[PDB]
Every structure is written in structure tokens, then in C-alpha cells.
């Protein structure tokens, strides 16, 4: 299994939206960063709750 770049983009978008809305961050982040790089770091660490469903 390998994430296509479209799947990765959608996962990052959804995670960033959830973080902005008020969801807790699963990892510690440096202060003064926007939700987007927070989600990017979350993905880079490999800690992602969202999963994709393929036909």
C-alpha cells in the first residue's frame, strides 16, 4: 500500500481543517505555526487517524 499524492493532499486538508476547528494535536508542535504545517508535521511523523477507502 502506498499513498497517491492526491490521497495525501486530501488527508492533509482534512486534518488541517479539523485542527483549525478545535481538534487536539496528537504531537507537540513549535509555537506560532498555522494549522497547515501542524498537519504536515503530523503526517511526516506518521501519526494520522484518517484512512482512505478504495473501491
Amino acid at each position: 500500500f502506498k499513498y497517491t499524492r492526491f490521497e495525501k493532499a486530501r488527508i492533509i486538508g482534512a486534518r488541517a481543517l479539523q485542527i483549525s476547528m478545535g481538534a487536539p494535536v496528537l504531537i507537540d508542535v513549535p509555537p506560532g505555526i498555522t494549522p497547515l504545517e501542524a498537519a504536515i508535521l503530523e503526517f511526516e511523523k506518521g501519526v494520522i487517524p484518517i484512512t482512505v477507502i478504495r473501491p
Partner: protein, 152 residues
Amino acid sequence: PPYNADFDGDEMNLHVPQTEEAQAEARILMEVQNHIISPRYGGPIIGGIQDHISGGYLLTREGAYFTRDEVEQMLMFAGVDITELPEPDKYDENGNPLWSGKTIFSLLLPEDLTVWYRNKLCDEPERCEALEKLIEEKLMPDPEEVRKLAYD
């Protein structure tokens, strides 16, 4: 090159995505890094244009040497992370050390890259034939032998 733009009055537009989904899409799907290789012919489309080629030739030209001051200054200007100069190649008449351009350029390449090809300056095919003969014969000739057979 990809934009096909020249600085003679050309104008450009920028749009700022607002929502988080759009920002993530732009960051992951549309960044300049991912579009180095052109979808059209499968080769690069981002690279040097005018000075990045001529200056590179000047730097790597046969018989071009640089003093210590120039070496340190150009390395710092390029942003290359270095903290000790390599061993000098050839000494100036009055005793100052010198560095050939080839080593300075080699300071940028990765540690295990290996490739060989013929460029556009090949005008004496016999020398290229000799070098290809040696390389094909061994696949890793001692760098001393290559130096005598060097050809730009």
C-alpha cells in the same frame, strides 16, 4: 522557462487561497519542487538559462584556478555548509595555495553520484574514444589515470 517569462515588462498574477483545504492542495500538489520534470517529454524543464551555463563553464573550464579568498567567498555565498577547505591543488608561484574549479564544483554533488557522457564541446572524438575505452574496460579506473586523459 516553465513560465516562459522575460523581464521586459511582463506582468504576473497571484491568487491567495483562503480555506485550509485549498491551502493544503496548493502546498502538496502545486509546489515548484514537484514540477522539475516536464510531463511533455519526461525531461527537466527547470534549470539554468544564461549565466548559470556560461559561469559554470568558466568555473569548470580547463586550466581555471582560484585563490583561497575566492574559494571561501564563493562557498559561503552559495550557502554550501562547509567548515574546512579541501587539500589545495597546485601552488601559486609565490607560494599561495590554489584550488581547481572541478573540486569546488564537486563539493556540491552528492557523495555517491557517478555518471559519464559527452557534452556539446566535444570536437576531438579521439580523446572521447580513449576515455570511453578506459572507463568501459575497468568501470572504476584509478583517478590518477583519468587526470592525464582529461578532456573538457
